[PDB]
Nucleic acid binder design. Structure first.
Lengths: 97, 64, 348, 130, 394, 353, 94, 64, 130
RNA sequence: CCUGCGGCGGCCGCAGGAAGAGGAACGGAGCGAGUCCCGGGCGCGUCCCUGAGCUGUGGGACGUGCCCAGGACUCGCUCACACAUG
């Protein structure tokens, strides 16, 4: 079933081989699980998170589009949203304090 | 601002009111550049300052 | 109109000037669009070119043909094909598949000329492997492609990374080597695979289950054709003289053998009538030859489009035209320009 | 004077427009200001570079301290916007219309002068990498 | 010849050989408070080091910032309070302070003390300073000779009102006129100041004494105590860039270029080196007594302000010397100094008071009742102890 | 002829010995050591390492196994796994040198690779800028998807550079300085994503492992085989002595602590590094820093963790200077001479007396 | 009306609507701010606004009354204040 | 394989895709020759490497 | 062209065929390939030297790294086969009807070209030892 | 009585102390085992292959013999229990 609520995840950058690259915008620089679903503002699943790549503060991700979705659909700086329980804090990737 | 400077041979600031040192080359503005707390452009400055070998790490270290 | 070789085909203008831009260029073959709108040509400079039917045919010395698009690949193209169901009536269908060295299977739109989609295939190490052959299913729903001991099936509706894998060599038994060409039967669920390991295999479209595996050419098989009869199909190879005919009824042995000169490691294309009667083949000697398949196929004609290898031929699906492509690799000695051309093969 | 102007250049001021190209850029700026197509000052220039606007960004190699415009030339490269340095602050200011100096402007295309704008665009894009 | 040299390297034997000669160090280029560390007068060498602290430069980047300060060049718009608030937010530290308040338009040297270094802020604020500024005369005058005469006349212990008030007295040690422009009547002066001197007031007084009237056009602080603009000075852009580089690349280097440890400020002061067992006692507020001392400099004088340091070169506290250098060398017992400002955090060094021979004897005698429960003598006290032991609390 | 040299020309860990700080200049030299270059050949190979140019077909594990069969030795270890097709600089440590392998595996790398882009881009500058974006501490996942789920982790790239771009073939040569454990295949994949065209790693070579680079002292597997052959057949050490270097060459960067001759075997048995044993010590010894403890002849005794700084060593007169991290030398290379000092003799006497 | 007066100091060159004056007060005592200043005739010229200069020889300035002009005053002219406003110098010195 | 190289005047490596270096020489493959532990031609290699003064021992000693 | 190829040579490159002997060897290789009487590549040449087949062995003088083929001259000198170096591997590939290069070819004697073959053998053994 | 921290240049509150400053073997090393996050590659040898397919500095077929993820953390066995001799 669809999630209860969703939080801002990323802006739309260029497509890449029937797969879309997004700049990640999360408030505490929280980082998604792999294969976490990605939604529109409509809470409507466009795909899943495939790759995470970037500098740890300032990083990108890639989305494997859904069965019926298609990379031409999207527009620059379009926002995508994710179930908040799928995010991880940036602290978790920093070493043992 | 009106305060300007040229360095000595000894390596320290000589303040002057002129736009050119006595050997004709431009005096620098005495005051630092304007700052605001919301610069997100630190990456850009670090990139360029690396490329031309002027990042502060690249200078030889001070006497301690 | 019809196809009938009572006489030598008549020259209509081709393209020679382009290929000179690269020294020692040659054409790797040509294919008509499945509606007959235009012709696609590969070349040794790895640029897929495309020419329309010159309206001078409808509207004397023609103008030299110039292509409308140039789809540049980065490395050597192994195979390329038109979308199986392309039409001029429907704009979105009109696209070209292409496979290149260590690149994915690029899809190019045939009107605009941009890169439109990519299919990516990976080995067990998550490394990209290139496809040596391509084929669109006769219902348009799938894109079959060939690999070393493997056929992978992509779905045209979901371009990306997802494919069924169909092993053709299993615990050292089956069809070995690089699967070089794929074809489908007009009637039946069969599809047929040729290999650089000199062998054929018949498989079930829905399963991928082997139906037969057939005797060898004396060289690696490089092309296939099914007749408009679902019953009968043809095959050729590299550095073989013989071009073989097969039948699904009384299978197990090539019914007839046909002679053509292939002395290079080249895909020398051959093609049938859209009605199936004639079989036309190129040759390394340059001589294009024709057989009548309406008993053994009966020789009809040989003519010489140019004094160099004829490596690609194709027959227009509606209209009497024949197209030929030319060139071969020039070998040195340590210290003759190639071209696409068109021909009329109807009555006077 | 150009040889003397090369004395004043700051450490990061490259690629530096050659003397002919420097005069060409002054002329192009003087044409563009008359159609009100230039931006000027780091604040305005960076605001419209964020907004999405394009052009040729011309930079004064005289600028000290460097920190003011340092973020600009990478910000160009992120947007693929061309940029070039020229050997004085005061002449850049004069061509922009400012009687006081200026350290950055952005010359934008318009139909009247676009022949010269394309001269500048191609010559600047064909400068050597430092 | 490296061919020859390398064949020698493989061919013939190398050894570090015995000698009878004296080993004399060269510590002249050890960092900060460890400079000329062998030239200190030595009391003893017999102690146990604890390996708990660090050399100030080589602190971990967390502790490096918390003990650190910045020699900042203040930008011209904000106030000093707002500047140190920015620096607090950039470094993500909890507390910050500065060496003196530059009113917003003024630029120059601002010694921004971070966290535990803010214990030094009062001593930095009291320090003598130097300024460069512009005086804008409202009317013409015979020339720069007159402005120089006015500056000479004002070079002294001075009356000053603050800008809008009460009367205050501040001294100006030395003044020179850098240059004067008769066209705009802008003159630039350099003055060495007692802390808290008002330069706006000085400019007004220069105007009044000349009779033309004048103001301060703009001002720059070129020196704040020990740090100068010649001396390791950093901009706000450097601070922000340093923290960004550290966050994104994990590169400590550029922060270590911008932030210095607080021990750099203390470098002028005389040193007094303590046993590691003494350190945490002094951090807790104990007296600085002779059994703790290992080293001490020449020219230590009564009531002089000295820096009390560990053997790793850290600063424990600022202190007031009670014994002269000669007295420290000769005496058997006593208090050598008393705390003025504890700099080091408590429990950086561990808790090792009351474990020594004399103190353990006293501690035992309390349980035996030979001293009162409060530690001072009784009739039960032996005559030897009651004679020999001098309680510093009387 | 040794007296002709500067101390800066002295080999390995004795280089610039006189610029160390001097605690004392007196000890009694024992006879039973050698300069690491002058070790007898068996001992030399047991302490040594090879700076290898790894071939293209085998895995690094196969390579080290072949080395320990070529040289007849029973233990080997390598600087860091190079994937089977990857060539370049692989430090191979032999026998006793295997004690340093964790230090080697932590050390920084440099790589030269080729990225193949799956579609055309405007030119080399795009690729260079995309390389700049991927400098710093980066998110990466190990390079196989076939295993269902693999953990994300952070790896740091210190520098990057683009050396060539070939627009005809869409091939670009990149040079990367990075920390160990960084996946360059994954870097090429992400670089392709960041350009938007796609990408693969075409080819890779490691040009540096820690302190050893491909520039100098690097040899081929053919050199290892042929050196062992020459030694076996003609009894000639010379060509092996150039193939294999003493492990002290790896430790050159570390800070040094020079011990009295009596202390050496005591340390080899597991004693802590006491201050009366110390002869010389280097500027910049810090608390908890990893340092090397050497003999007067230059032989590395152990890797030690310093429990004193340089100034603390200057001030004190006894106590623990350092504790052992890892002991390189073998027991009884030097004779037992502990328990004979003044204070220890007093303690012995008074326990009996 | 003033009870009694004593010397403040001696005239010096004028300033912007103001008189700058050299204080020669007995034993160098210091005025209040806003302290009314009188002539030898005991007519008020204005009031003290600034005190400046180094301690011993210190100067001061007067905000003149609207009736008076700075042009009127003369070299070596002396000025006066009620002694009950003067402050001892040792309040500031230590 | 694609990586070629040539030497800089320092003796450092410059990596290229070009089969020729800018001064006209051929570039070398960056990768070493293929190896087998069962190789039996060690004698042959040592023999002609000695013959042409390019055996490793005949090179000058490396400074350590 | 022989000089330019001469620059490319290995350290082990002697004895090096004369320019005319180089042409003779190429044409002999051409004739032998038409007769199906060469072995080429280190793998084949090494194997068929092991089996003991006679011939002339022609080596590319520009082959780097040398360690791929440098064992071969001693394999010849053990059996007293003739051998010679030629200026380039690309020419050696070209003479064998190949566009790819190759670094070693062994030319076996056969009837048709044997006069030229015996001439080639005669000159190759005439070559000075280094 | 001393220090530290907060609040309006002294005072008030709260918190930490009441400190004479110990310890010239502390509590180690080396080796091995256990607990938590082989189907193939490679090497060699009965024949093909300058493929437009990587490729002759090597690719394939058929045979045939060497290689197998790192890091945390605990302790059994051997040797010492070492202040390093003017």
């Amino acid at each position: 079933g669809p999630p209860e609520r969703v939080v801002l995840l990323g802006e739309f950058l260029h497509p890449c081989e029937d797969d879309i690259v997004c700049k990640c915008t999360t408030d505490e620089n929280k980082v998604p699980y792999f294969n976490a679903p990605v939604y529109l503002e409509n809470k409507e699943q466009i795909g899943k998170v495939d790759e995470i790549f970037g500098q740890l503060r300032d990083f990108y991700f890639s989305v494997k589009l859904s069965e019926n979705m298609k990379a031409s659909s999207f527009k620059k700086l379009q926002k995508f949203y994710i179930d908040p329980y799928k995010l991880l804090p940036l602290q978790r990737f920093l070493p043992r304090p | 601002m009106f305060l300007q400077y040229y360095l000595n041979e000894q390596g320290d600031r000589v303040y002057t009111l002129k736009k050119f040192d006595p050997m004709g080359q431009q005096t620098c503005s005495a005051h630092p550049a304007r700052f605001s707390p919301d610069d997100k452009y630190s990456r850009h400055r670090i990139t360029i300052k690396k490329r031309f070998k002027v990042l502060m790490t690249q200078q030889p270290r001070p006497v301690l | 109109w019809n196809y009938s070789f009572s006489q030598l085909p008549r020259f209509l203008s081709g393209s020679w000037s382009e290929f000179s831009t690269q020294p020692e260029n040659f054409l790797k073959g040509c294919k008509w669009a499945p509606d007959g709108s235009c012709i696609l040509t590969n070349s040794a400079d790895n640029i897929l070119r495309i020419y329309n039917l010159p309206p001078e045919l409808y509207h004397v010395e023609y103008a030299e043909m110039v292509p409308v698009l140039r789809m540049v690949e980065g490395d050597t193209i192994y195979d390329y094909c038109w979308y199986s169901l392309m039409s001029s009536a429907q704009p979105d269908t009109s696209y070209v598949a292409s496979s290149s060295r260590e690149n994915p299977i690029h899809i190019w739109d045939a009107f605009t000329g941009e890169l439109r989609a990519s299919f990516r295939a990976y080995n067990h190490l998550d490394e990209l492997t290139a496809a040596h052959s391509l084929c669109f299913s006769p219902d348009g729903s799938q894109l079959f492609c060939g690999f070393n001991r493997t056929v992978r099936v992509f779905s045209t509706a979901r371009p990306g990374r997802d494919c069924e894998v169909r092993a053709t060599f299993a615990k050292k038994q089956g069809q070995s080597g690089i699967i070089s060409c794929i074809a489908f039967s007009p009637a039946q669920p069969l599809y047929a695979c040729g290999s650089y390991g000199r062998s054929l295999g018949l498989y079930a479209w829905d399963d991928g289950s082997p139906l037969a595996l057939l005797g060898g050419h004396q060289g690696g098989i490089t092309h296939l054709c099914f007749h408009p009869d679902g019953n009968r199909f043809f095959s050729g190879a590299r550095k073989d003289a013989e071009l073989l005919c097969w039948d699904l009824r009384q299978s197990g042995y090539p019914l007839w053998s046909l002679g053509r000169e292939v002395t290079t490691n080249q895909r020398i294309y051959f093609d049938l009538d859209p009605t199936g009667q004639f079989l036309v083949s190129g040759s390394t000697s340059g001589a294009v030859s024709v057989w009548d398949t309406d008993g053994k196929p009966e020789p009809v004609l040989s003519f010489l489009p140019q004094k160099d290898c004829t490596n690609g031929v194709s027959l227009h699906p509606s209209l009497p035209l024949l197209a030929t492509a030319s060139g071969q690799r020039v070998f040195p000695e340590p210290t003759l320009e190639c071209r696409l051309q068109l021909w009329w093969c109807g009555g006077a | 004077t150009y040889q003397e102007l090369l004395v004043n250049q700051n450490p990061i001021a490259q690629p530096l427009a050659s003397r002919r190209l420097t005069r060409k850029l002054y002329k192009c700026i003087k044409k563009a200001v008359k159609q009100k197509q230039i931006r000027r000052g780091v604040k305005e220039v960076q605001k419209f570079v964020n907004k999405g606007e394009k052009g040729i960004m011309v930079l004064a190699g005289d600028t000290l301290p460097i920190e003011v415009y340092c973020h600009l030339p990478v910000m160009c490269e992120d947007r693929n916007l061309p940029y070039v340095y020229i050997p004085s602050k005061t002449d850049l200011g004069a061509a922009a219309g400012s009687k006081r100096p200026t350290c950055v402007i952005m010359v934008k295309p318009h139909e009247e002068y676009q022949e010269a704008y394309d001269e500048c665009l191609e010559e600047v894009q064909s400068l050597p990498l430092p | 010849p490296e061919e020859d040299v390398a064949e020698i390297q493989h061919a013939e034997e190398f050894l570090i050989k015995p000698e009878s000669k004296v080993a004399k160090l060269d510590t002249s280029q050890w960092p900060l408070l460890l400079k000329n560390f062998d030239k200190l007068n030595v009391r003893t060498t017999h102690y146990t080091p604890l390996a708990c602290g660090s050399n100030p430069l080589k602190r971990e980047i967390g502790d490096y910032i918390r003990t650190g300060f910045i020699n900042l060049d203040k930008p011209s718009n904000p106030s000093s309070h707002e500047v140190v608030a920015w620096i607090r937010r950039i470094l993500r530290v909890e507390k910050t302070g500065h060496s003196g308040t530059l009113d917003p338009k003024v630029t120059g040297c601002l010694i921004v003390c971070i966290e535990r270094a803010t214990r030094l802020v009062k001593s930095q604020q009291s320090a003598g300073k130097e300024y460069v500024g512009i005086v804008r005369l409202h009317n013409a005058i015979e020339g720069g000779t007159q402005l120089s005469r006015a500056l000479e006349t004002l070079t002294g212990a001075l009356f000053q009102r603050p800008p809008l008030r009460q009367l205050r007295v501040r001294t100006i040690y030395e003044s020179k006129m850098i240059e004067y422009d008769p066209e705009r009547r802008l003159g630039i002066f350099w003055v060495s100041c007692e802390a808290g001197t008002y330069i706006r007031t000085l400019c007004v007084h220069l105007g009044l004494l000349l009779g033309v009237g004048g103001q301060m056009q703009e001002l720059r602080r070129v020196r704040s105590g020990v740090m100068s603009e010649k001396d390791h000075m950093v901009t706000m852009h450097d601070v922000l860039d340093a923290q960004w580089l550290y966050d994104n690349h994990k590169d400590e280097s550029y922060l270590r270029r911008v932030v210095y440890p607080l021990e750099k400020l203390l470098t002028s002061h005389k040193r007094l080196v303590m046993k590691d067992s003494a350190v945490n006692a002094i951090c807790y507020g104990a007296k600085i007594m002779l059994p703790g001392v290992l080293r001490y400099e020449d020219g230590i004088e009564v009531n002089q302000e000295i820096v009390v340091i560990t053997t790793k070169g850290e600063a424990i506290c600022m202190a007031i010397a009670l014994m002269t250098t000669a007295v420290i060398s000769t005496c058997d017992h006593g208090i050598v100094a008393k705390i003025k400002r504890v700099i080091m955090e408590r429990d950086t060094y561990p808790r090792k008071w009351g474990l020594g021979p004399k103190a353990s004897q006293k501690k035992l005698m309390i349980k035996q009742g030979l001293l009162d429960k409060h530690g001072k003598p009784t009739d039960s006290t032996p005559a030897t102890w009651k004679q020999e032991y001098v309680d510093y609390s009387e």
